[PDB]
Amino acid sequence: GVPTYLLPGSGQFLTTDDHSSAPVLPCFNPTPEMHIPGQVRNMLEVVQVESMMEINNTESAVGMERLKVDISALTDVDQLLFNIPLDIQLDGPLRNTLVGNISRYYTHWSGSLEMTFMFCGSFMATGKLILCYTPPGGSCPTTRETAMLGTHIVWDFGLQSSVTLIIPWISGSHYRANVGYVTCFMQTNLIVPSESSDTCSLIGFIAAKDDFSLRLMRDSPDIGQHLHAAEAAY
């Protein structure tokens, strides 16, 4: 017949190989494909859906108090409210997001992030915040006067209720000091009427943008191990 010879690497089971194999049941015809809503073909479709940051990543924030930052009429005129360390690799506010969970299955990420802050005070609550983006390696500001040398915007949340803050292209695991910051200072005080509550809250979101990229897939550090009824399958 055909003269053959066996190469080095015959008979091995590489777990990542892509060959066909013997169908254990031929002529079993599976149930044909019905149209089910919301098919995911690419995990970058999931990563671009916005999801809440825990910008209240502290003790004494029990459960859902971690998802919101309270601003009040007793906060100072130029007080620092919160800062968001731009760590997808490290456990921070971005860990339990759709952009933070899917990216921990991969080793190298690269792309632009998209932060959205939504003000959740009353209709007549008025004030100004100033959201400052600090590039990696730059100094995280402490005063409102210092935070003018970088990319910052002044947000009057009487006019708007939402603000999109495009974080520029980072390229991710090229640094391996921090990978960036987003801080927020009071500009004015919180001005509420007497019937409104004097404490108002912010919700932060983050999504990836269209230039986002994930490669060199690993297993996630988040899950890991007992399981009850694990020997019921045997």
């Binding site: 079993f28 919301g38 690419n42 502290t58 971690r66 800062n83 399981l227 399958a233």
Partner: protein, 225 residues
Amino acid sequence: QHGVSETLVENFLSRAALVSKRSFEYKDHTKNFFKWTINTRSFVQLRRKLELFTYLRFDAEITILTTVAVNMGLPNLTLQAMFVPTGALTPEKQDSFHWQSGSNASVFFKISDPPARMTIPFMCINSAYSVFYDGFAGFEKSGLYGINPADTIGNLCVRIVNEHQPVGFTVTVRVYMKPKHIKAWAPRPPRTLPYMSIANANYKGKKRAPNALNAIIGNRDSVKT
């Protein structure tokens, strides 16, 4: 794999993983055979990836890897891995009549060979497997919650075909399952809390943050730190 993206749901999920690892003893005295109900709930690394989705449609590429060790010379044994789907009868014993079944697909392989490999097709009667089922199996109130009867793949029964010998050797059967032709619908939040069982989605959380019940992310000192 060979896409462009590496985040394709085919690329994200078609990746061979040890779904089952059980040794079973074999001797001349009269379980002496391997049996495993085919699911993915057993290992939490593959489980959390497949629980990112609500509906999954895939073929299953089983790869039985069999080692033998002494309790001189490792014997060359013949094994039978037999896929018993849902609706057929399973062997209760190693020498039962159900191993002789014409209709249950068996495979006969040696320890000296490369590992046995089959592709189990899409075995559901619906158009996708229900990773999460918000319902009850039986038409009574005694049914279990979260268990779709249409969702079971089958059983993978593995025995040693050889007759019983006085020698002492333990046979370890590693089963590697690798999904193929994955179609996936309706993505879900990734699970933060640790699993309590494989039969359900109960939650307790860890004692302290991270992944605690009231604190998923580990804390910092202040919000302004």
